[PDB]
């Protein structure tokens, strides 16, 4: 019964809500593998730009609202970069805008790693021919939007198989007795 | 002669012949066309633990699924057998 509602919330076929987002990022595992392989994407930048060309879609969405929240949240994050001293004035960007509609609504973990890549690779951005961290960041945001879990995904079942199937290959109780317990 | 029909005839074309396609599970028109029944019953799977005392048993007084549309028979009185043996 457990599936993705069209609102990105995971509801059961009953309607009971389980999570407000899938894994908290709305990312499909069958997409993620390179979603965090930035340098690879960069050396093959022009190909990915040919796949995910945004000019076709820049007419269907907003490229700022999420980016603006990114600005206020970047403010609180630079100010608050101890855990219980949470961003209570700023939920994560995924809380405030549908990540499939406003490019830039992305996990703060993903955003952080992406920026840290852009800073630690500014020198590749000083070795390129025609690429910038604003157009590259734009590409990675668009890849992120294009990696989102589709409405209606059978993620409950998928989860169950992803725990069962590998458990056939299987001081304290381990393995199947632990999982059954 | 006897007649055909003591079960089914094709009410479509007036062709009173019947085919059995055991591979199809289908009773069909020997000469013409169509489905004489979609339903096909009794060719069980791999599950007859035989708990069934199945006391019934055929004895030719409850007829039979008629699985032969081929027929001719005759009127009978009821088990020639004794008259046959006589």
């Amino acid at each position: 019964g457990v599936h993705v509602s069209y609102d990105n919330s995971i509801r059961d076929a009953d309607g009971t809500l389980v999570q407000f987002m899938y894994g908290g990022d709305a990312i499909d595992i069958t997409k993620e593998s390179h979603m965090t392989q930035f340098e690879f994407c960069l050396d093959n930048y022009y190909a990915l730009l040919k796949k995910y060309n945004p000019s076709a879609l820049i007419e269907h969405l907003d490229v700022e609202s999420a980016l603006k929240y990114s600005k206020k949240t970047l403010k609180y994050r630079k100010k608050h970069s101890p855990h219980y001293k949470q961003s209570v004035k700023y939920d994560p960007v995924l809380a405030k805008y549908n990540p499939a509609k406003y490019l830039g609504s992305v996990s703060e973990n993903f955003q952080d790693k992406l920026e840290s890549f852009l800073d630690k690779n500014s020198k590749l951005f000083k070795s390129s021919d025609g690429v910038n961290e604003k157009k590259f960041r734009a590409l990675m945001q668009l890849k992120y939007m294009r990696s989102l879990i589709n409405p209606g995904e059978a993620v409950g079942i998928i989860a169950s198989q992803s725990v069962g199937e590998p458990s056939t290959q299987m001081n304290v109780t381990l393995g199947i007795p632990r999982l059954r317990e | 002669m006897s007649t055909f029909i003591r079960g089914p005839i094709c009410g479509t074309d007036n062709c009173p012949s019947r085919l059995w396609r055991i591979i199809d599970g289908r009773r069909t028109c020997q000469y013409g066309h169509v489905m004489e029944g979609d339903v096909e019953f009794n060719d069980d799977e791999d599950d007859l633990n035989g708990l069934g005392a199945g006391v019934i048993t055929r004895r030719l007084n409850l007829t039979t699924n008629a699985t032969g549309s081929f027929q001719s028979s005759q009127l009978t009185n009821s088990q020639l057998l004794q008259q046959q043996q006589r």
């Binding site: - | 055991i22 001719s72 028979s73 005759q74 088990q79 020639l80 057998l81 046959q84 043996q85």
Partner: protein, 172 residues
Amino acid sequence: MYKTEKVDLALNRNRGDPITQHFGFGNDEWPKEWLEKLDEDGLPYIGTYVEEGDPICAYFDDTLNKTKIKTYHSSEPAYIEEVNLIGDESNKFQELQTVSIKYRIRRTPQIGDKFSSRHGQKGVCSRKWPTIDMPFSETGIQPDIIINPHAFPSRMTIGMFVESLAGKAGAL
């Protein structure tokens, strides 16, 4: 592969009574093409090729006034190897009510049939490779069977390697 069949007439219990069905015919109206398979006594000619649908025996039941036959139902043909008439354990049984028919089904090596060495390294035959396409030795031969080497590293059937080299020596 041999399959044995028992054609029983134990149709009626009560330990006997009536018993009336006799292998043979009565109405003549039966398809005389049944003679193409069953001898005029109602039993198939030993040696006969049978394909799905052919009659395996023919008999007559007075109750139905009809000459009936027991058909053979299989996906593939066989040949009748022996037909044995059983009167045994009987007190009278003059009607010849039990007949045993043994079918011979040939099983040619075919794609998917399983083969194994004495080393528990079992495999199906994937294809019947043309001999010209086989690899040929400088001795002028092309192998009988080709087994993939990639099987040995997990199984460690090195006894099979030794059997190869011993059978080669032992033939030479």
